[PDB]
Design an enzyme around this catalytic site. Structure first.
Site, PDB file in Angstrom:
ATOM      1  N   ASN C   1       0.845  -1.191   0.000  1.00 27.05           N
ATOM      2  CA  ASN C   1       0.000   0.000   0.000  1.00 27.05           C
ATOM      3  C   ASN C   1       0.871   1.227   0.000  1.00 27.05           C
ATOM      4  O   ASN C   1       0.419   2.333   0.263  1.00 27.05           O
ATOM      5  CB  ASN C   1      -0.887   0.005   1.243  1.00 27.05           C
ATOM      6  CG  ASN C   1      -0.084   0.079   2.548  1.00 27.05           C
ATOM      7  OD1 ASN C   1       1.053  -0.421   2.632  1.00 27.05           O
ATOM      8  ND2 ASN C   1      -0.686   0.688   3.582  1.00 27.05           N
ATOM      9  N   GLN C   2       2.136   0.994  -0.298  1.00 20.31           N
ATOM     10  CA  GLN C   2       3.174   2.012  -0.356  1.00 20.31           C
ATOM     11  C   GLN C   2       2.985   3.034  -1.491  1.00 20.31           C
ATOM     12  O   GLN C   2       2.280   2.779  -2.464  1.00 20.31           O
ATOM     13  CB  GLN C   2       4.485   1.277  -0.556  1.00 20.31           C
ATOM     14  CG  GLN C   2       5.667   1.732   0.229  1.00 20.31           C
ATOM     15  CD  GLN C   2       6.618   0.577   0.385  1.00 20.31           C
ATOM     16  OE1 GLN C   2       7.822   0.739   0.624  1.00 20.31           O
ATOM     17  NE2 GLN C   2       6.068  -0.623   0.250  1.00 20.31           N
ATOM     18  N   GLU C   3       3.633   4.186  -1.359  1.00 24.14           N
ATOM     19  CA  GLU C   3       3.588   5.240  -2.373  1.00 24.14           C
ATOM     20  C   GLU C   3       2.229   5.589  -2.959  1.00 24.14           C
ATOM     21  O   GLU C   3       2.119   5.834  -4.165  1.00 24.14           O
ATOM     22  CB  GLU C   3       4.533   4.906  -3.530  1.00 24.14           C
ATOM     23  CG  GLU C   3       6.033   5.088  -3.245  1.00 24.14           C
ATOM     24  CD  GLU C   3       6.515   6.527  -3.410  1.00 24.14           C
ATOM     25  OE1 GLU C   3       6.016   7.216  -4.334  1.00 24.14           O
ATOM     26  OE2 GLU C   3       7.404   6.959  -2.632  1.00 24.14           O
ATOM     27  N   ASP C   4       1.207   5.610  -2.109  1.00 22.36           N
ATOM     28  CA  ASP C   4      -0.155   5.978  -2.496  1.00 22.36           C
ATOM     29  C   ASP C   4      -1.073   4.961  -3.133  1.00 22.36           C
ATOM     30  O   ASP C   4      -1.981   5.314  -3.879  1.00 22.36           O
ATOM     31  CB  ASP C   4      -0.141   7.245  -3.350  1.00 22.36           C
ATOM     32  CG  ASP C   4      -0.149   8.505  -2.499  1.00 22.36           C
ATOM     33  OD1 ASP C   4      -1.105   8.680  -1.703  1.00 22.36           O
ATOM     34  OD2 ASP C   4       0.801   9.312  -2.616  1.00 22.36           O
ATOM     35  N   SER C   5      -0.834   3.693  -2.848  1.00 27.55           N
ATOM     36  CA  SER C   5      -1.711   2.646  -3.337  1.00 27.55           C
ATOM     37  C   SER C   5      -2.259   2.011  -2.055  1.00 27.55           C
ATOM     38  O   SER C   5      -1.669   2.145  -0.979  1.00 27.55           O
ATOM     39  CB  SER C   5      -0.955   1.634  -4.235  1.00 27.55           C
ATOM     40  OG  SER C   5       0.312   1.232  -3.733  1.00 27.55           O
TER      41      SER C   5
END
Ligand SMILES: [Zn+2]
Ligand SMILES: [Zn+2]
Ligand SMILES: [Zn+2]
Lengths: 266, 82, 131, 65, 46
Positions: C1-5
């Site tokens: 869910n990193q970098e805006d996911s």
């Protein structure tokens, strides 16, 4: 009796609060997952729509029909059509329901899961019965219709498991806690002034002896005694969603022995 | 006495049937009760006229000229027959 | 869910979290020529055609409302006369696919055959999806 | 838009509870907060499901053929 | 026994063939739908 013990605290038709003690966390957990994901159940999984004039679209309704809980007591003696030898399906592998509604009343006619009508031979066995826990005994409002709105469907419930789709799960929520007084230090509470004052104490604090400063940090301390609560949607009796879980997981562990065996051959 | 063209009408406006209509009236008309109108319906599609902003007319305003300019200041008035 | 996911519960998506319907409406009419030359809505063959299955096409050159369409199946059969049969059908958006949801046939001021088809699809939340 | 059968989050049945809840409000003149607890909807995942549903189906029905 | 088209308002199984106007038996309402298929359709119950 022998290895990891239990001590059922409260217990009803829908929930089974209990204390699993002297078990490994690994195990306590695996069981938890198994109860959620892999216990076999029966649910609608094919809807042949003949007529529909409701405000809902075919697949909208078909969707619901799938989550509608169905009897799965004797699911253990029904086959996965994928294993049954018929071309497609039979009474040896499926249950067929029927739905027919027509707005006769000039006042919103309600389609309930009680209006499902088994057609295939149940070969005498608890299976495919629209589980109803409703007070009026209608359970799950499938959909509503006006004047001359008709809805003629056909369903084909089949055996399944959560992993394939959630509709097949029988558990639906499962309480799970351990070491209510952070004695293992498996957590590190966040706070402003006092962890203790700010972080609510659990009902389970009682059934376990409080900390008491003086004492050093017991690191040797492992972790057994888990306060769980298995709720059930109905398809299966709460006690079963526990035994069957205990069993399924077991057979799985078994198939690995079995596998290592045929692999012995060469 | 004489006919000269067709004037596209704005929904929910006085000259539109929907104006006086109500709850039941609408449903039976198929138009949604929650609609707010305010648009036209040219050749099928719903068209919305977007407000065009501009400078009010007939007004006096003075502005200074740039350093390089034989003119120092100026008084403008855009006169338009209302 | 990193970098805006984000990570999304599947079981939830199953029990219907965030599902949606999606309707699309294709449309068409029969051209008229001052020197009486008109097109037609029918299920042609031999006699410049398409490539998608014309089968789902009835004789009015339309698809019945319960029909599952896909690929480039023809949703509207039509032909133009010029000198016999040059096609003028209307295949479903090459990428889309669903279930014909509602067809309707009306006239248009100059009394021509007017029709609008409407395929409906249910789109379930998948990985690349935005929220 | 019809009550969801089962809550997205935990999956606990909730398709039945619609009508019951609408009563505990109108007739038994209670407050949402309690009406929900009455129907056995414990945690917010189940609560939020009913408390928030917008039974649009009704305005839909009100159309005609 | 069967049908084909319909009237949007006065929902009344109608139908006809070419050059049969495009109106209804009563309601002028020149709309007309195309009622379901006989070939039953099936669905994935997920
Ligand atoms: Zn079979
Ligand atoms: Zn829930
Ligand atoms: Zn009519």
């Amino acid at each position: 009796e022998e290895g990891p013990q239990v001590k059922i605290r409260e217990a009803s038709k829908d929930n089974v609060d209990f204390i699993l003690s002297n078990v490994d966390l690994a195990m306590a957990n695996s069981l938890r997952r198994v109860m959620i994901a892999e216990i076999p159940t029966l649910a609608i999984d094919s809807v042949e729509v003949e007529t529909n004039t409701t405000v809902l679209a075919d697949e909208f309704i078909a969707h619901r029909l799938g989550l509608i809980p169905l009897q799965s007591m004797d699911i253990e003696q029904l086959e996965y059509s994928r294993d049954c030898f018929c071309e497609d399906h039979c009474d040896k592998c499926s249950v067929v329901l029927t739905l027919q509604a027509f707005g006769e009343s000039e006042s919103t006619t309600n389609v309930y899961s009680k209006d499902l009508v088994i057609v295939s031979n149940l070969m005498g066995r608890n299976i495919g019965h629209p589980i109803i826990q409703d007070k009026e005994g209608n359970g799950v409002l499938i959909c509503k219709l006006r004047k001359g709105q008709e809805l003629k469907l056909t369903c084909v419930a089949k055996k399944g498991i959560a992993k394939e789709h959630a509709k097949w799960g029988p558990a639906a929520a499962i309480e799970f806690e351990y070491d209510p007084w952070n004695k293992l230090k498996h957590t590190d509470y966040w706070y402003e002034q006092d962890s203790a004052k700010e972080w609510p104490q659990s009902k389970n604090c009682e059934y376990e002896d409080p900390p008491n400063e003086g004492d050093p940090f017991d690191y040797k301390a492992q972790a057994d005694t888990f306060y769980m609560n298995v709720e059930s949607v109905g398809s299966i009796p709460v006690d079963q969603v526990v035994v069957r879980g205990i069993d399924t997981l077991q057979k799985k562990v078994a198939s690995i022995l079995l596998a290592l065996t045929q692999m012995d051959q060469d | 006495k004489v006919f000269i063209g067709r004037l596209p009408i704005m929904l929910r406006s006085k000259n539109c049937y929907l104006s006086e209509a109500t709850e039941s009236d609408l449903y039976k008309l198929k138009e949604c009760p929650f609609d707010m109108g305010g648009y036209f319906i040219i050749n099928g599609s719903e068209k919305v006229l977007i407000a065009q902003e501009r400078s009010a007319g007939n007004i006096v305003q003075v502005f200074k000229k740039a350093a390089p300019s034989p003119i120092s200041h100026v008084a403008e008035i855009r006169s338009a027959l209302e | 869910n990193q970098e805006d996911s984000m990570i999304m519960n599947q079981s939830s998506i199953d029990r219907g979290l965030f599902r949606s319907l999606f309707f699309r409406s294709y449309m068409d009419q029969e051209k008229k020529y001052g020197m009486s030359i008109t097109e037609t809505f029918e299920k042609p063959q031999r006699t410049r055609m398409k490539h998608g299955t014309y089968d789902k096409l009835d004789d009015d050159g339309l698809i019945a409302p319960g029909v599952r369409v896909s690929g480039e199946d023809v949703i509207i059969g039509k032909t133009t006369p010029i000198s016999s049969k040059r096609d003028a059908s209307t295949p479903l958006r090459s990428t889309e696919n669903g279930i014909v949801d509602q067809v309707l046939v009306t006239t248009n001021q100059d009394g021509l055959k007017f029709v609008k088809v409407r395929v409906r699809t249910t789109k379930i939340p998948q990985i690349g999806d935005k929220f | 838009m019809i009550v969801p059968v089962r809550c997205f989050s935990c999956g606990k049945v909730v398709g039945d509870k619609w009508e019951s809840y609408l009563n505990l409000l109108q007739e038994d003149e209670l407050d949402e907060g309690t009406a929900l607890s009455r129907l056995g909807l414990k945690r917010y995942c189940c609560r939020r499901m009913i408390l928030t549903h917008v039974d649009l189906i009704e305005k839909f029905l009100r159309y005609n053929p | 026994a069967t049908l084909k088209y319909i009237c949007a308002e006065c929902s009344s199984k109608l139908s006809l063939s070419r050059t049969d106007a495009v109106r209804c038996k009563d309601c002028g309402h020149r709309i007309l739908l195309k009622a379901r298929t006989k070939r039953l359709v099936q669905f994935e119950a997920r």
